[PDB]
Design an enzyme around this catalytic site. Sequence first.
Site, PDB file in Angstrom:
ATOM      1  N   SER B 112       0.831  -1.196   0.000  1.00  0.00           N
ATOM      2  CA  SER B 112       0.000   0.000   0.000  1.00  0.00           C
ATOM      3  C   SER B 112       0.874   1.258   0.000  1.00  0.00           C
ATOM      4  CB  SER B 112      -0.980  -0.027   1.177  1.00  0.00           C
ATOM      5  OG  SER B 112      -2.083   0.822   0.929  1.00  0.00           O
ATOM      6  N   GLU B 237      -1.658  -2.458  -8.048  1.00  0.00           N
ATOM      7  CA  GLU B 237      -2.854  -2.777  -7.284  1.00  0.00           C
ATOM      8  C   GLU B 237      -3.374  -1.513  -6.618  1.00  0.00           C
ATOM      9  OE1 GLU B 237      -3.576  -3.282  -3.672  1.00  0.00           O
ATOM     10  OE2 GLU B 237      -1.728  -2.257  -3.102  1.00  0.00           O
ATOM     11  N   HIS B 305      -4.476  -5.757  -1.348  1.00  0.00           N
ATOM     12  CA  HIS B 305      -5.149  -5.569  -0.064  1.00  0.00           C
ATOM     13  C   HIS B 305      -6.101  -6.707   0.299  1.00  0.00           C
ATOM     14  CE1 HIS B 305      -3.592  -1.526  -0.579  1.00  0.00           C
ATOM     15  NE2 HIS B 305      -4.022  -1.193   0.625  1.00  0.00           N
TER      16      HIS B 305
END
Lengths: 335, 335
Positions: B112, B237, B305
């Site tokens: 992230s 992502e 995630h």
Amino acid sequence: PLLAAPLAVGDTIGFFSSSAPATVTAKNRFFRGVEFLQRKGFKLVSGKLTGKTDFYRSGTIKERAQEFNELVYNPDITCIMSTIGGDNSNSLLPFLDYDAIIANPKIIIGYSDTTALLAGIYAKTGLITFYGPALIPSFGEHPPLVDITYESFIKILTRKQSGIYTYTLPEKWSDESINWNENKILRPKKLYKNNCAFYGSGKVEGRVIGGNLNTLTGIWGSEWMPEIRNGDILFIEDSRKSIATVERLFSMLKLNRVFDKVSAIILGKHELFDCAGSKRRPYEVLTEVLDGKQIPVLDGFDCSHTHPMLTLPLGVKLAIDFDNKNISITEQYLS
Amino acid sequence: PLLAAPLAVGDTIGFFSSSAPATVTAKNRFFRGVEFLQRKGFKLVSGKLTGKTDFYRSGTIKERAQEFNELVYNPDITCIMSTIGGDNSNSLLPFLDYDAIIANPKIIIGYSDTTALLAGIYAKTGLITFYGPALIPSFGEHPPLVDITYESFIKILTRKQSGIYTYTLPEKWSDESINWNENKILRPKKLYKNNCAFYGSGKVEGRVIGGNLNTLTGIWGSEWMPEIRNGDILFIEDSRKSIATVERLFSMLKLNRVFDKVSAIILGKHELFDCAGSKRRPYEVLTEVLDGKQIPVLDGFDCSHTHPMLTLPLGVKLAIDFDNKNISITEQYLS
């Protein structure tokens, strides 16, 4: 720079929806904006995606580019105005007719997500475009704030191009999230005294560049991001962001060596900034990120998502006098 | 490339909080994650900002850089692991001790927001870092999914570096936002069959580059963004984004000529993607943005995630076999 012809009362304004389909989702406010400008004497041409929806957007990437291009091709149009922002105008950039823009320069105006187009068009053509009113959020606003927005719009775009132009300071402003798409108001917006601050001394003059900072991330690194040069004044505004996001965006600029180049920074008033309980304002966050760099900052310029909104040409010289607490356009921006 | 020493059972893992202060705000999950790794035999060193809060972050920019650097200076630590992401790790980049990182290579792992550090460190040092588990979200996950995450973590980081490594495919996965920070689950998460798709044919081998796409915008254009080159495989992502945001980010890549360079794209499963009622998936949006450019796509790799999460070295060669529907690491990534 490439300059468009000045606006005149009675001219034709074309509008386009490069992202959010707000002519449908905010139809009441849209109609208020249309009626407001028509009452002022303007003729309006609706872009081909008016009244259309593709869920989160007005149409496909290619259809949105076509909508914009068709307004450029229309010889009667002197001003091309965004209906509203959103998230997705950067998608259009490979498909805009930059050669047609060069061939027939027009006033192109909007804000927020439309930054991608304003900056992209400038990068490709050198056309001086405008950070300013969009039809729905800006001109669909209820009086009295819409009148102050209009006063700046008409002054900037119609005035004679002789001598500097020094901006007026709105006496009161608001960022209250009421009276958006409702037909009749229950109460006027809460008004705040203008708390804009001039951090620095002397006078700084340089080419203004920027717009909505979050939106700039969508074009950053590409041929559509205008190069920031030594001496530039960086203009940036954001809306409804967390302090976390604001730190991220400021640090992005730092990593890109932007703060080694700029002579000053203009921060637009941040609509409903979320400080996460820290009580910190964006300027304090900028100060930490700057890590000692003495860049003068105009904090709280009324050219953002707050009401009222001033109209700002992008890509021409401004002078910020930090001692006299004023800001002026010093370079010709219309033909 | 610069390679870290491999992990082994009984090694010391140091953890840091480069953004969100989740050792405080998700303390129960943090404790569960700590206990999980300790029961596996790992010794843990807590970063200096553990248990601290500065509202939206763990500490000042410099405090956070210091926390990370202190772990690099510790000769006992084999692996430096993020506690959690957030928004603000890009701020740290000017202040990391890159010379110390080169002198003392370690396994650096997270995902992230931590992408800013993983990509930035690679750009500055050539060190192969890892897109993979963070202590709180990944190892604080309740059974059964945490075990699958751990299996990949331990396999990737401890295996002998001989021959290619072909990834296992998780049998079930979830993206539900429940069971976050309590002792017991509210109820079991929905378990989905693995619906990853291989769009294209043949085999593509190239250096993998990327991470969290939204986070990459915070380092884009800077010396900390690794240069994407012809033949690269792009790994991206995102989490909990609107389709509007996803279009914006894909178009950003397009404008930057990324799709003129890359030989394949890996899309991590997008946690709780918001299609705005369109029923469209990210691959469909990518297809529109690509505008006829034929690039093979692995849609739905389990490195994102969603749970469980696989561990992926960044900056080394992978081979995606679109006919046999598998993905392998083909280049040495640890000593």
